[PDB]
Structure formats: structure tokens, C-alpha cells
Amino acid sequence: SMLSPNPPNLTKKMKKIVDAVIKYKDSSSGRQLSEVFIQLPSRKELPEYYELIRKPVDFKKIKERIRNHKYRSLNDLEKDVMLLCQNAQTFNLEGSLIYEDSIVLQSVFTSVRQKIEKEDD
Numbered sequence: 001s002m003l004s005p006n007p008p009n010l011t012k013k014m015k016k017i018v019d020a021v022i023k024y025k026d027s028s029s030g031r032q033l034s035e036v037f038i039q040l041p042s043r044k045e046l047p048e049y050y051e052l053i054r055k056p057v058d059f060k061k062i063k064e065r066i067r068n069h070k071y072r073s074l075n076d077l078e079k080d081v082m083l084l085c086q087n088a089q090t091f092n093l094e095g096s097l098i099y100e101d102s103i104v105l106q107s108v109f110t111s112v113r114q115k116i117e118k119e120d121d
């Protein structure tokens with residue numbers, strides 16, 4: 001809540017981590033793996049997703065939760081990113097493009113978080 005903000009360095013690290021996850025591009029393919037995950041379609045647009053996924057989330061919402069200080073730790077942020085990817089893996093088949101992209105984005109998050117959490121070490 002804005003009534004009691006996070007320390008500014010935490011907000012800054014959250015933003016740096018999510019920005020790097022969103023910008024990640026495979027070199028061999030050129031594709032920004034996050035693009036399909038920025039905004040989930042609405043219930044009227046993709047009702048099958050909401051029948052299968054109990055807790056929908058997208059990167060648009062994750063960015064809002066950084067800016068509103070809803071996440072109180074990098075762990076809080078990580079839980080939502082991993083929820084997004086697990087949701088993608090539940091709605092899509094193993095080996096499909098969107099499933100596999102979400103697997104890589106999990107690893108990108110873990111790698112980026114390690115670098116940024118320790119950048120003052």
C-alpha cells in the first residue's frame with residue numbers, strides 16, 4: 001500500500017527484475033518470450049482460460065503490484081511470476097510454444113533475480 005511504501009531500493013530491484021524478464025529475447029529466434037503474457041484476454045474473449053485457471057495473472061498486473069507496493073519482498077514478486085508461468089503450463093500442452101516459453105521465463109526470472117538481488121554484494 002502507498003500508505004506504507006516499500007524501501008525504494010526494493011521497488012527498484014523489483015522493476016529491474018521484471019523489466020529484464022519482459023525484455024528477454026532468444027537470439028536464434030528473435031522473439032520476445034514475454035509478449036503473449038503481458039495482457040491476458042478477458043473472460044468474454046477467452047472463457048476457456050477462466051474455466052481452467054483459478055488465479056489468473058499477467059505481467060500487466062504484476063507491474064501494477066510493484067507500483068502499488070503490494071509485493072513486500074522479492075519472494076512476493078517471484079510467487080506471482082511463477083504463478084503466471086504455472087498457469088501457462090496448465091492451460092497449454094507440454095512442448096507447445098507458450099508452455100515452453102513460460103518454462104524459459106521461469107529460469108530467466110530466477111537468473112535475473114540472483115544477479116539483481118546480489119548486485120550490491
Ligand SMILES: Nc1nnc(-c2ccccc2O)cc1N1CC[NH2+]CC1
Nearest residue numbers: 036037039040057058087088091098
Ligand atoms: N494460450 C495462451 N496461454 N496463456 C496465455 C497467458 C497470457 C497471459 C498470462 C498468462 C497466460 O497463460 C495466453 C494464451 N493465449 C494465446 C493465444 N491468444 C489468446 C491468449
